[PDB]
Each structure stands twice: as structure tokens, then as C-alpha cells.
Design a protein around this ligand. Structure first.
Ligand code: HEM
Ligand SMILES: COc1ccc2nc(SCc3ncc(C)c(OC)c3C)[nH]c2c1
Length: 450
């Protein structure tokens, strides 16, 4: 078969389709129109967007495809370097860092982050307890305060003190600007037009703000633990026998500060969004929180007891996976789905929100928010639900994000009643990652001591 392709713009081919503030949502609409696979061409570049579990299960075969750096990721390497997220699988620094840092996400490590997660979660509950009547909550803004602080504290013993700030923290402002610019770059026909001279200048200055903070974390540690930073500076890879060098460690820190919070903020924001729009689901989740979380602060074992809350989060990730795409390349010539020949090196994009809407897997009601879908996660076929990516290049922090989200959402649901007082219309902001923009609620305290 010859694969479908969306509308073209003469010599720019499909490039102008990306000239939009919401390019993943645009791609999703193209998928609904064209089906499980389409070609996307730009001047000098081609990739193939996959949306069906039928093809994606083959894309996920690590003997045939490896992680690719999409254009997006190539632009973000400018500050992420050969950190775990933007390193090729075959770069020496990938497996070394993987091996050195995986022990920071062991069960014992997770247990040892619990207390610090609680520290930040108590700060969020308190801010909300302390609002006056009729004040409201800027949801994704507060979720970012919580998630950035949580990775700062758990990972690096560093306090961003975001709940002591009325604006976003400076690190968040430059992060968002840098991600925005990477996203806007995707559509640029002539990236070296001098019209983009200012864009590049703002980009470097934002890279600088982020690296200045990295330098401080490193200085604090040299001046003061058993956390992610301890492993970065001290662990040896059992294979090579070598530790990470200084340059790579700096890339790891920036990588973990961003990947370690942005997408978790998004998940909590989408999860609160879907709860307030599904009052019976909210009540069922609130019932579990009350039942389970009997003590003044949650225990580790208690968070693991929050099954329905877990289900809520996975259902939020099904509809709006907050890192919505990952990319693969063909390790050798190969045929996808018995119908689409690929040559070695050809690129694929997995369009995760469309995968998550495959009616052959999920049934006809794919737009409904139904956490019950996840009542037995075993039931889900392989490669049908991939919000944390694939194989050895899957999310290292999956358990950390989920533990944090589950803890926080559990506390919110124990401690407050929520009101969607504006009848908020979902508006999804893209910064490569996804998050609701302008989402606000009011929270009425249930006056349960903390
Ligand atoms: C809901 C929250 C999260 C989502 C949806 C998410 C998603 C993802 C995805 C889709 C990938 C694979 C990317 C690719 O194939 O190009 C990935 C990788 C990664 N994630 Fe996460 N992530 C989340 C939370 C976190 C957290 C909390 C951390 C850190 C504690 C983190 C650290 C990383 C790292 C370092 C990688 C690269 C791993 C490797 O290739 O060795 N993630 N993530
Ligand atoms: C058209 O090209 C695109 C567009 C949007 C995209 N969004 C993505 S999601 C890429 C991504 N995944 C996971 C994490 C943890 C992460 O850290 C901030 C990022 C930037 N890739 C894209 C590629």
C-alpha cells in the first residue's frame, strides 16, 4: 500500500501544518481523517505518524526499531545534551547513566522519597486551606509549584520554594520559553533567516537561567544525603566500571528537573479536570481517599492502597498523555503491517493520544472518562497504553510520577470539595508537552486536620 498524506503547500510540502500553537491536536485531527498511518513531509525530511495499536505493536519491537530523536528532541538536546532523554541508545553515555541512575527508582529509593513528597503535598493542601472565601485556585500553576518542588527536594535536596512565590519560579519561565521556541522552530522553513536572531538570543538566555540554577544545586551539594544527585556524583556503572563525568552530570540535572516535573504537573491538572467534569467519578475517588487515608499524613503503604485514584490517573493519561509523542527509527529494512515497506533509518512517530483512542482496543466509547477501564490492567493488550514510552527507553521516572500524583490527588480528595465554578472549557496548551490552560476551580475545605 501507498500511505495517505495530509494536504500539501507546494514546495513546503506539509511543513505549514505545524504553523499552529497546537500541533499535536492538529496531527490528531489529521489522524482521525487519514487513519492508522500517514506520511508527513517537510523540505528534506520525512516521518510517518502511527495511530493504531496494530502498527504500534510492531514499532515497539526493539529488535526492529530503536528510539529516534524527533526534530523536537534534536532542538531540546541543545540544553538536554546527552542526558538520558536526548541521548541515542548507542551513545556510551546512555547505558552508563541508565545503569547508574536506575537504582534511584528502586523500591527502597521510592520509600525513601515518600517523606519529602509529603512535605511538598502538605504545602499545597495548606495553601488551599488558607484561601479566603470565594478565592480560587489556578490549577496547572499550583500543580507546577508542587511537581517542580517535589523533584527539586526528592532528587537534589534543593528547595525551589515555589509556594512562597506569587509568580512562576524563574526556572519555570525560561523552561516554558525554551520549550515554546523548540516547538515553534518545528514549522520554520528557514531557521537561519536573521528574522530569528532574537529568538536564538532569548533561547540562549533561557538556557543560561536554567544552567545557573544547575550550578547552584551542584554548589549546595559540594557545600553540605542519599538521592538522585548522590548517584550522579558517586555511582559507578557496573558494566564499564566508570562514573558519569562532570559535563554529563549537568545535563542529567537539567533533564531530571524538567522531565521530572512538567508532565506530572500536566497529569494532575488533567486528572482534576476530568474529576470535576465527572461528578460520580469524583465522588467514587473521594470515597476511597476518605476510607484509605485515615492518618494525618499518608503513609507509603497507604498510597499504594489508592487503587481507584490510580485508575483515575491512568485514565487521564489515556485521554491526554502529557508527553504525547515518541519517535523510532528502522534498524534495518523492514515491512510494517505487511503493507508498508521501510528502509533502514526511516522514522516513525507514535501519536500516543490516537493510539489511546483505538476503538479496536478500547471499544466505541473512547472519549468517555471511565477509570473502570483500568480495573484489571492485565487485561490491556501489549503496546495499547504507552504514556511512559517503550522498552529500555521507557520512562525511568514512571513510578516516581505515579506515586507523587497518587499521593497528591489522594490528599486533595480527602481534604476538599471541588467546584468547577466557571464551567471551564478545556483548552490544551502545547509546549511539546500538554497541559490545560486557564483551568480554575474553587476548593471548599472539609476541615480535616493535617
Ligand atoms: C506522567 C508523568 C510522565 C510522563 C507522561 C512521562 C513520559 C515519558 C516518555 C513518553 C518517555 C519516553 C520518551 C521517548 O521515547 O522519546 C519518557 C522518558 C523519560 N522520562 Fe518520563 N514521564 C513522566 C514522568 C517522569 C519523571 C517524574 C521523571 C523523573 C523522575 C522522568 C524522567 C524521564 C527520563 C530521564 C526519560 C528518558 C529515559 C531513558 O531513555 O533512559 N519522567 N518519559
Ligand atoms: C511534530 O513534532 C512533535 C510535536 C510535539 C511533541 N511533543 C513531544 S513529547 C516530547 C517529550 N516527551 C517526554 C518528556 C519527559 C519531555 O520532557 C519535557 C518531552 C519534551 N514530542 C513531540 C514532537
Amino acid at each position: 500500500k501507498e500511505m495517505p498524506q495530509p494536504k500539501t503547500f507546494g514546495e513546503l510540502k506539509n511543513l505549514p501544518l505545524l504553523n499552529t500553537d497546537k500541533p499535536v491536536q492538529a496531527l490528531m485531527k489529521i489522524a482521525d481523517e487519514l487513519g492508522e498511518i500517514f506520511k508527513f513531509e517537510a523540505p528534506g525530511r520525512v516521518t510517518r505518524y502511527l495511530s493504531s495499536q496494530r502498527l504500534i505493536k510492531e514499532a515497539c519491537d526493539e529488535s526492529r526499531f530503536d528510539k529516534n530523536l524527533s526534530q523536537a528532541l534534536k532542538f531540546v538536546r541543545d540544553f538536554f545534551g546527552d542526558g538520558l532523554f536526548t541521548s541515542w541508545t548507542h551513545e556510551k553515555n546512555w547505558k552508563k547513566a541508565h545503569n547508574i541512575l536506575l537504582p534511584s527508582f528502586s523500591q527502597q529509593a521510592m520509600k525513601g522519597y515518600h517523606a519529602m513528597m509529603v512535605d511538598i503535598a502538605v504545602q499545597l493542601v495548606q495553601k488551599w486551606e488558607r484561601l479566603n472565601a470565594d478565592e480560587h485556585i489556578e490549577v496547572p500553576e499550583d500543580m507546577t509549584r508542587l511537581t517542580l518542588d517535589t523533584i527539586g527536594l526528592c532528587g537534589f535536596n534543593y528547595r525551589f520554594n515555589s509556594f512562597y512565590r506569587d509568580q512562576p519560579h524563574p526556572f519555570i519561565t525560561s523552561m516554558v520559553r525554551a520549550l515554546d521556541e523548540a516547538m515553534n522552530k518545528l514549522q520554520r522553513a528557514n531557521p537561519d533567516d536573521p528574522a530569528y536572531d532574537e529568538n536564538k538570543r532569548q533561547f540562549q538566555e533561557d538556557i543560561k537561567v536554567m544552567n545557573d540554577l544547575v550550578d547552584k544545586i551542584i554548589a549546595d551539594r559540594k557545600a553540605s544525603s542519599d538521592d538522585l544527585l548522590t548517584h550522579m556524583l558517586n555511582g559507578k556503572d557496573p558494566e564499564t566500571g566508570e562514573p558519569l563525568d562532570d559535563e554529563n552530570i549537568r545535563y542529567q540535572i537539567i533533564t531530571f528537573l524538567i522531565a521530572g516535573h512538567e508532565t506530572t504537573s500536566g497529569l494532575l491538572s488533567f486528572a482534576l479536570y476530568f474529576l470535576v467534569k465527572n461528578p460520580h467519578v469524583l465522588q467514587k475517588a473521594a470515597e476511597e481517599a476518605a476510607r484509605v487515608l485515615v492518618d494525618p499524613v499518608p503513609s507509603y503503604k497507604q498510597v499504594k492502597q489508592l487503587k481507584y485514584v490510580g485508575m483515575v490517573l491512568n485514565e487521564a493519561l489515556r485521554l491526554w498523555p502529557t508527553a504525547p509523542a515518541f519517535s523510532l527509527y528502522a534498524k534495518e529494512d523492514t515491512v510494517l503491517g505487511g503493507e508498508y515497506p521501510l528502509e533502514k533509518g526511516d522514522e516513525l512517530m507514535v501519536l500516543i493520544p490516537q493510539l489511546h483512542r483505538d476503538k479496536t482496543i478500547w471499544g466505541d466509547d473512547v472519549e468517555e472518562f471511565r477509570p473502570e477501564r483500568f480495573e484489571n490492567p492485565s487485561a490491556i493488550p501489549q503496546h495499547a497504553f504507552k504514556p511512559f514510552g517503550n522498552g529500555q527507553r521507557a520512562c525511568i521516572g514512571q513510578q516516581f510520577a505515579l506515586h507523587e500524583a497518587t499521593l497528591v490527588l489522594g490528599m486533595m480528595l480527602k481534604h476538599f470539595d471541588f467546584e468547577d465554578h466557571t464551567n471551564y472549557e478545556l483548552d490544551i496548551k502545547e509546549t511539546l508537552t500538554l497541559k490545560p490552560e486557564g483551568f480554575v476551580v474553587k476548593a471548599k475545605s472539609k476541615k480535616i486536620p493535617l
